[PDB]
Design a protein around this nucleic acid. Structure first.
Ligand SMILES: *OCCCCCCN
Length: 250
DNA sequence: CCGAATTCG
């Protein structure tokens, strides 16, 4: 009743192979789960055009119009759009930024945020600086609003540790749920074959952070999506997506 | 997008 739902997913728009099957896979997931909000990363303009035709029950807010970029989709008749804000990462080398959408949903106000933090091992320093910027913006939000960040952070655990960890008032949804093993890795070369990497690597790149008054926002479930291998023998993306439901109390 | 290689202005 007062439950809200969202999916966050890096859909790998930079991979040009099997795009029509993969996009159908993404739109199938979105239509069948029909979450209130969808956070997307690594979208490209033809992918955006596809979503407008094949996911028309959502209003699409985008992080850029060129290259690859993020987007937030809002369920028509369920989410009320109030404002949009985009904040640059001045030192990015990969056009990354912070997309914020303020909405009303189920009678409550939310600041929804997504980003695709700087990629690869060698760009650890800038990734960490971007993480700090995001957390900073979460904390500067009006306390009247509930802030939810969901995105592809590209983080390694040691990177969070070395920068001091999350602030006391920002929670990681996966940690909040007791670190369940079933959705621990969202990028996994043994379970996912899209990149054709021989060695076995696995990471929790996709993460959900939230800031809210005590007891107000209670994560209920977190599951992987995009697990069905497609006709071509690959997955919709090199990432699993995350589907989260949360209860909103008063 | 790991870790490494190639292309070219
Ligand atoms: O996923 C981010 C794209 C960066 C691609 C780097 C390829 N090694």
């Amino acid at each position: 009743s007062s439950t809200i739902s969202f999916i966050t997913w890096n859909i790998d728009g930079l991979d040009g192979c099997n795009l029509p099957e993969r996009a159908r896979g993404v739109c199938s997931c979105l239509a069948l789960y029909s979450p209130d909000v969808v956070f997307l990363q690594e979208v490209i303009p033809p992918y955006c055009a596809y979503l407008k035709k094949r996911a028309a029950s959502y209003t699409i807010i985008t992080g850029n119009e060129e290259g690859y970029f993020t987007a937030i989709l809002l369920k028509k008749g369920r989410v009320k759009f109030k404002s949009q804000e985009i904040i640059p990462f001045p030192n990015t080398k990969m056009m990354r930024n912070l997309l914020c959408v303020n909405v009303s949903l189920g009678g409550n106000e939310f600041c929804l945020m997504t980003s695709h933090l700087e990629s690869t091992r060698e760009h650890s320093a800038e990734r960490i600086r971007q993480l700090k910027t995001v957390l900073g913006k979460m904390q500067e939000a009006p306390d009247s609003t509930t802030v939810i960040f969901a995105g592809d952070t590209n983080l390694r655990d040691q990177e969070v540790i070395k920068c001091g960890g999350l602030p006391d008032n920002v929670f990681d949804a996966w940690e909040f749920l007791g670190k369940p093993k079933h959705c621990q890795y969202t990028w996994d070369t043994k379970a996912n074959n899209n990149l054709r990497i021989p060695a076995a690597y696995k990471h929790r790149f996709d993460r959900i952070f939230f800031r809210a008054e005590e007891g107000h926002l209670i994560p209920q479930s977190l599951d992987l999506v995009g697990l069905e291998k497609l006709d071509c023998g690959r997955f919709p993306s090199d990432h699993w997506g995350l589907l989260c439901t949360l209860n909103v109390v008063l």
